[PDB]
Design a protein around this ligand. Structure first.
Ligand SMILES: Nc1ncnc2c1ncn2[C@@H]1O[C@H](CSCC[C@H](N)C(=O)O)[C@@H](O)[C@H]1O
Ligand SMILES: Nc1ncnc2c1ncn2[C@@H]1O[C@H](CSCC[C@H](N)C(=O)O)[C@@H](O)[C@H]1O
Lengths: 240, 245
């Protein structure tokens, strides 16, 4: 079982519904989260939603008997009331996501579930070192988003529409071979717009400085491995 | 969707979260360490069978309660500082006990030796010494006329250093749970079972009322209400799961 799917599984484990009839995997990507939902609930009762067509084609390939749709979550609403709105590692990219989440709950039937997970990594050395490399190099002109709200803001936003709200924060640990391994990992986690802004011809110098900073920030354990942290916030709400 | 909702007991949330990460389909000789009145033990017997789990505790009154509730399950008295199973274990499960055992990390590494290959050590410990609840205990103690009367968990990397050599894999994670609370008094009531007792005892009977009053004021100041007026108490907890080499 993949360490990459651990947050999705931990989120789903907290969904209190024994059965789902109109469930959605929001920001489904290539169908890894969606397959977790279909495994639990059935292939015919989950619809994956995403804004990226290439994601939807991969998801549809992986799950040939499951429905998929293209939409922007900033405004999306289901055709009928949902009993499950599940969204693993998407809402960090949605502006004003708390308001979006509150509005989504109006799209749930009574007893329906909203379940959301978001990375909380902006203050981890991986992300701090991105700004440092950007601001400290000869490409710094190219560089001339928001923190996650505290748990209490999720209660304030969602409690008025919910019979139950549960919020928790977990810091997972992933041993990594070396600094190069962390840098490679983080290409899928936010390094990519930094490299884009720095420029193709600066790619090597940027990555070199960034790796040095990673090596400095993540000291080796006794076995030489580095310990990368993944802080993540989880919210589960049951609609009144 | 209302008819399909199924809520689990919130009081066993961390024990359940811990157990969910135990990669054993079957257990033949498992132990619930610091079993207490058998809440954790029943999670284990629910999953693996009443016959394959033994609860261990140093408190006789606890074991009696657990034995009454699980009458077909084994229970033994021991101090975890020194205890080893009389036969190799395939599961050593310990929810919210090891914070009370001196030099627990040394104890855990030694306990790995008592696991068979592929066996599992699973541990959860509270990590709330730096929470406002516990800080306010020190401020109350140091600030009152009783002032004269008056260990953090190691980082995840230390758990890897101690246990990885004896393991095919180790998993460490840290979770902050949030508990909405009615009011400041309900937080005070909670921590009377969560670390306030050594204070209070140290302060003396004559100072109990005054200590508690000041402590409550500090709690009221330290926990801002949510929009609905409820307070939000955090529970930081450390989880460690190791699979024997
Ligand atoms: N505004 C938006 N509307 C719909 N999908 C969005 C979106 N913003 C980001 N996404 C999608 O959300 C996904 C984030 S990657 C996370 C995907 C998956 N749920 C998982 O568990 O891994 C990407 O597929 C991205 O295309
Ligand atoms: N050194 C020690 N050896 C054995 N048991 C101990 C111990 N120190 C504390 N305990 C026991 O550990 C328990 C902690 S509270 C009970 C924890 C229970 N496993 C649960 O999931 O909630 C108490 O029953 C206490 O008697």
């Amino acid at each position: 079982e993949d360490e990459r799917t651990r947050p999705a599984r931990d989120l789903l484990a907290q969904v209190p519904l024994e059965r789902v009839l109109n469930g959605y995997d929001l920001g489904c990507g290539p169908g890894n989260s969606t397959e977790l939902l279909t495994d639990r609930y059935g292939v015919n009762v989950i619809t994956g939603i995403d804004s990226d067509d290439d994601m939807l084609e991969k998801a549809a390939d992986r799950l040939p008997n499951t429905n998929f749709g293209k939409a922007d979550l900033a405004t999306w609403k289901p055709a009928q009331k949902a009993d499950l709105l599940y969204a693993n590692a998407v809402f960090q990219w949605v502006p004003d996501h708390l308001a979006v989440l509150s509005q989504l709950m109006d799209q749930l039937e009574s007893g329906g579930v909203l379940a959301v997970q978001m990375p909380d990594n902006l203050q981890e050395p991986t992300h701090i070192a991105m700004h440092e490399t950007a601001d400290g190099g000869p490409w710094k002109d190219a560089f001339s988003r928001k923190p996650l709200p505290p748990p209490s803001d999720y209660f304030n936003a969602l409690s008025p529409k919910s019979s139950r709200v549960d919020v928790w924060h977990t810091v997972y640990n992933h041993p990594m071979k070396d600094a190069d391994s962390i840098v490679e990992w983080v290409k899928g986690t936010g390094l990519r717009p930094y490299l884009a802004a720095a420029g193709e011809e600066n790619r090597e110098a940027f990555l070199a400085d960034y790796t040095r900073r990673i090596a400095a920030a993540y000291p080796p354990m006794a076995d030489g491995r580095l310990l990368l942290r993944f802080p993540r916030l989880f919210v589960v709400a049951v609609k009144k």
